[PDB]
Amino acid sequence: RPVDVSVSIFINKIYGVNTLEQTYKVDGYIVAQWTGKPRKTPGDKPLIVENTQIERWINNGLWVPALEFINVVGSPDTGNKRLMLFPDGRVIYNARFLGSFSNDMDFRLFPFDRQQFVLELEPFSYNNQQLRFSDIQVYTENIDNEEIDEWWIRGKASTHISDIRYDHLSSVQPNQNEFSRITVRIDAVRNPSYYLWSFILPLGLIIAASWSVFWLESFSERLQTSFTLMLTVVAYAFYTSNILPRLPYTTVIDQMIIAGYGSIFAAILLIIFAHHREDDLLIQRCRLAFPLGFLAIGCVLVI
Template structure:
């Protein structure tokens, strides 16, 4: 009986083993790997000068220093020397096994000129990248109040190949903290601002979600100095308009016509002058409105003297009409300019 029982137990054990072999082996679920935190890169820019501001092309030149600093815990041990030591790579190729974040200036035209650059590797795995750069930047400008306009000069720095999940800019700083008139000779610097935001690009991804990149923004707010235009544009235009009103004190009709036509031609030269200062715009600037109003004032004066000459019956009537225009035209022009100033600047 014992051999029979042993045979049955072996048969049952074989069946159990066979059943277990039919099911996949339960594998212990491996814990999900946590994704590394994004690399935090601190950014600072030290301005040397903003110059060659071209209102026609809406561009400006910037000369300055860019500093990027970050901590790389994966830095190889051969670069981590004893405390206090550091490696400096200057104006040459950096080691390929050192992570140097790739970046680009978004609003620069063409390539930036790098005058000098260096990479500092500290023993505590902190790295500093520094370069002196020079380039022509662009920004959108609003000329409605020109030449008393306020503009925002921007520097936009963005990660090129590393998305926001891999790299973020932090602690942006623009130096010097106080920007005086020496940095922008033709402008009064009002304020500055630096911040980091996120930019989404749908064309870089096949799905609709898109890819986001960290962008660092430096903004300098400035107002154009108006003194040059007061003496070179507004004063001559004002004198020409006032001169056009003096024809009402001239008694000879031929002299009145000559004066008016001469003043009209003089105003044309100012139109050419201002057109060379501004781009082709879909709207009129304040200085253009002043020049156009000068055209209109001189033209209306010309019509007034012709009307007076054609319809006045005697010398007494001519004097009365001229006396009326001597007051009417200055008041009308001043009222128009005041309304334009209120509408545009207030």
């Protein structure tokens, strides 16, 4: 009959987010408990088998199933391992792990993006007719000093035990293709404090200051200053790119940089148009029309 396995995962740390790879590091413990055939433990007390010695018990016939992290990128770093063998037959496997996990992550709303760190566990060789997950318990520590952390864990870990029906199953034949899978989801929100005050705020001042070109008296002053403005945006796009994470798409900050280029370029066209088509009264006094026109297009960027 299917072996019921009770799992408990302790998450110690979630860090090392790789934006381009869509990977993140998770440090914690994994506990698995199942009941086997009763054993004759020394003095009828639970027997502890640590690390190297675990393999010796397996060689002698102890059944220790391999549980694979479906979404782990490469073999995880396993710390200390232990087997607690009870005389009644129940076995408790406990091990420390650090692994790089993968999940579909959308950073388009950066620096206001919300992600969910997922862990997918499943037996490597035994279907749900042989091994089934009875329950899952996830324990996340509290973010004591949340202001100091890069990510803010919002939701207490979500858990779900599902059954994945694998298609191409070699020599399984009747029904050796349903596998029990534990799925853990930890919701988190990025800390945008740094990006708001050091990236969004100064950029706003740069774009706003670029509109002051219309307050200049001479055409030669309006056009020459706009090149210093253009150079300021380039210098800022560079300051942004060197710090911001690399992605295959544009973020909120990136779009602001593009808007900055557009605003300065549009102003250059207006400056030339007014002077070569006696300066136009309305065009030269667009000191109020240009910022409002930009803010109007800016509202569409949000909605």
